[PDB]
Amino acid sequence: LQAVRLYEKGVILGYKRSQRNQDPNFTLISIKNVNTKKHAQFYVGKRVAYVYRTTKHHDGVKIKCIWGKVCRTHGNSGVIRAKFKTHIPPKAFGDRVRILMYP
Amino acid sequence: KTIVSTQKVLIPEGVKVAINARKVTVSGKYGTLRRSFRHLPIDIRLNKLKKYIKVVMWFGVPDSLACIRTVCTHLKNMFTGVTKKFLYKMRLVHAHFPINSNIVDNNTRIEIRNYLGEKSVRFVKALPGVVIEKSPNVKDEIYVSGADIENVSLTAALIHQSVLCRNKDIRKFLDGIYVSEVTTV
Amino acid sequence: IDNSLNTNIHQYHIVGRAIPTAKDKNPNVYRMCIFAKNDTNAKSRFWYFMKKINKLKKSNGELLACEQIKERFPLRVKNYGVLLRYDSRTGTHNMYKEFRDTTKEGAIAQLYSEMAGRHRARASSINIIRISEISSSLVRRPHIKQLLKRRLRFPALHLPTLQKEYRKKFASKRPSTYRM
Amino acid sequence: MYKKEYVIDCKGHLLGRLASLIAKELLNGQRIVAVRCEDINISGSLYRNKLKYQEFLRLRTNTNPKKGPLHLREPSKILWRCVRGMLPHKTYKGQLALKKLKVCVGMPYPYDKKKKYVLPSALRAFRLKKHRRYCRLGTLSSRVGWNYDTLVKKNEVLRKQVSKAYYKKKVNNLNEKKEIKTEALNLINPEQRQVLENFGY
Amino acid sequence: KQIQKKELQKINHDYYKGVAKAVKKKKKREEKKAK
Amino acid sequence: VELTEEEKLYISKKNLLFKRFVEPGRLCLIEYGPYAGKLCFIVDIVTITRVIVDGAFITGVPRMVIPLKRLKLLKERIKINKNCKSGFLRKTVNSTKVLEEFNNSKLGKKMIIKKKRDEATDFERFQVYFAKRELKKKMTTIKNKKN
Amino acid sequence: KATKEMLKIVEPYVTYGYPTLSTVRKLLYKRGYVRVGKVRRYARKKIQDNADISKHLGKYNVHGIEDMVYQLYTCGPVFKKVNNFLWAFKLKPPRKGFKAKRHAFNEPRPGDWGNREAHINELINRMI
RNA sequence: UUGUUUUCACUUUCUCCCCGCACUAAUGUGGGGAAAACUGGCUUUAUUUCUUCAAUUAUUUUUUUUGCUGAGGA
RNA sequence: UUGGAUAAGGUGCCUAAAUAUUCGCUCAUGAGAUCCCAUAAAAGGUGUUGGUUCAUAUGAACUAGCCCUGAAAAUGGAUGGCGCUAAAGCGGA
What we know:
This is part of a larger assembly, with seven protein chains of seven kinds. Chain B is of the alpha+beta class and about 180 residues long. Chain B is about 15% helix and about 25% strand. In chain B, strand 2 (about 20) and strand 3 form a beta hairpin. The longest helix of chain B is centred in the middle third of the chain and has 19 residues, at about 65-85. In chain G, about 30% of the residues lie in helices and about 10% in strands. Chain G is built from five helices and four strands, in the order H-E-H-E-E-H-H-E-H. The longest helix of chain G is centred in the first third of the chain and has 11 residues, at about 20-30. Chain G starts with a helix and ends with a helix. The interface of C and F includes residues 5, 77, 147, 156 and 160 of C. Chain D binds two RNA strands through helix 1, helix 2, helix 3 and helix 5. Chain A: This is 60S ribosomal protein L35ae, putative.
């Protein structure tokens, strides 16, 4: 009905890390219907929006979004690395992210 | 090691078979036949006007390429046994006490006494639908019978191992319950 | 072409001779033909065999030409011949060999996996000898006769392997094992 | 992964493979409800797994077995513990992932009629050679002292009967909906008819 | 280039004959040593 | 020295457990690998695990060795010679028009429908939506009528 | 003989091979840095121009990267003034990785060290 | 102290026949023979978009979608 | 510091990356599982497979990979854990 989507679903996994060592500059993100590196490469220029809600208003609104974009694929199972303006807080691991259709 | 391993059985003329899901349904004279063989990888080719069963194993490597041989002789003996009842030849054995038999309840719940003078209760069973009963020719003989190989065979198997005594040398104390030979009706 | 299925061997033939000396004015030219992972590996193996069978090495051996001589028709079906010699943890043993692939290149590789899987003989412990061609009725192996049988068939006891794209995690209902 | 919750039928599923898949899903944030955990299969002989569980049973804190490893003989609890062993339950995120899992024996009330999914990567029929030995988690639990196996079976058969009747109703509903489609189609205009035919609808 | 490939046929068939005759003499020596 | 009608009938009534004879001359569609989506006739059997598959050049796919592990073949068959080469390969195939009789089976029809549904553009996607909308309208009105 | 004998002693810690013209041209054009300063004060500098090549070698008539690839590939009358003039190439790790730095390229098992001969071109342009 | 040549034995088939005569996994098979050779290879002819023209290497020229970076201020 | 790409080592989960592909071997009623490394021997082996040797599709003798016996210790217990057998084990590619 209302509230058109025009974006693809993603889930924020942890950071770009090794065993017992993290690099919070890049965050791993899994996209809804991608399971191969070749298909994950289809989303590179696309912007990524992490839209979360706060307990109180900040600009008359209770919703804050932080922006990033997918830089490359991670692994060969359709997982991408995304770089955001500010580092994703680890409390957001497992949360929903929007892979937008633009550019 | 190779790919197709199978035997062309010769179906007895006195039976009529059919197959479904490795469950073979057969009819002879005494009755009908089925069995669960789902522990083995087995396929079947079958004919009825031209007959003969073929139980086939594909890509059978030799460790399990003997499952086939077992069943190929086994089922071939199955229809023959159900047509002509398989008769082993067991003698009740005693060196001192001629054996006491209280065969209550129509071949079911057989009893054994007069075996080392304990004068207590002992009873080993058999398969239903299989007979192991006194031969009127000699009291020391119980003729076995049945229709299946295993039917006529466990009923001769479970018995040798039921009333065994203690602290006696079998090399001189020759007590037992012997099974010797196999014949047919 | 499938790189996952592929080995990495082509034909070589590099012509030379042992070093001519004042002592031996005109040493005879010689030759030998093998295959390995690449041309440099083949040269190293050739010089190893030269040192082991005769007395000459890189230091006293040179060459005068080199070429790559592909086969007559790459996509044929062949029956060629070699023999094997390998050492175990306690001795040394030998046999012959002939396996069927398309051509010579991959003919060697199927045997290495077989030896590694059955006798745990690493490739450094295996020597293959005398590449030639074999007949078809002369096989004394339980398998290779029915390779060239007039007419043969077997079923598809295949267990499915699909693309990673369709290898989905949650299935609606349990898949079967008949296919076709 | 992107559903509100996934209901998994654990029948004919290998315990460790199922637990690994479930643990990764839980860590990524997907809620999982595992039903019919008493039909989980384990590779290896029933006596082998019996020996393994007796080795686990003889294990306890000598000073105070109250503090020792709890043994949790119900098959659902066995699957739960196996899953917990595959995630970092000592951390806050790992504890959340662990609590995001529900395990049941049989199918309780709010799982009669939601879709039950299956992980083919853990099915016995695809992961085990047919000639090789396997066991059943319900039987193993009954051998180590669960003693609720028969009741679960008798509840399961009643569930089977209810589902049989309601599926029999559903197929009639579906075929009636199909036969009304037939003359809903030819009464529709040809330009829509052709699109529907050529796109397989 | 027909003539060039013919000359290469000659060059490689010389190698094939050499390998064949090496095989032949190896077999002859083995058969002599067989007993 | 032949048995006629029973020989013809009981063979059809046999209901064997496996099918799709792997005789050389069949066709195939690969199930795993870069060629999953390309058609190849079956050439011979090299080993238990490897086979050789080869599409007609009209299909445009080569003679190639593939493990049997990656295969879902075709039911059709041509009658080429054992030494039939790719001058007769392009003739035997259009002699019988072998491919056409597969894309009328259920799996082939499903595959074609899925392929063209994937290739569908946005406008025809909306046309599908609109047609389903009208069909649903008609479903509802005649379902109300059926009372 | 001298360089080959001295290289044989570091053989297990290096991999070397035949460069070929395209690879040496690529190395000089995209990874070529040059020692510009006065004696023992060289101050590494990317080529970017022919001026310093002419300043240090033009009086020796080798002015130009065109002239200098033609001198490195065919081992001409001047290596003392081209190889020494070049700063040691600082290469990236291989794009697709090594096989095993621990083992020789000539072993049947995967390995890296030793003489690759002609097979070093792919390694160089993968490390470049 | 070798080159060189000669000798036979092989291959396509839904060919066919006979014996077991259905014993075939099949719309055949185990054995013995006749067939042409619809297989194939060979030598040509004009064409390679009807259909292949590959793979590797050497030597070159591009191209799709995109991540990060912007020191300096002559 | 920002990006890229790797070494050693790994890619079932813990744990980033293969329930990857491809070829074999192995069932253990105390399987096995990364140098140092965290023990194992003599002695026994008609399962597998390639063997090797000799006797007229016919027998043995050897040989060697995996598996088993040999193989018993004290708080409860450790291939790191879970677990794993169409391996997530062993030997390759």
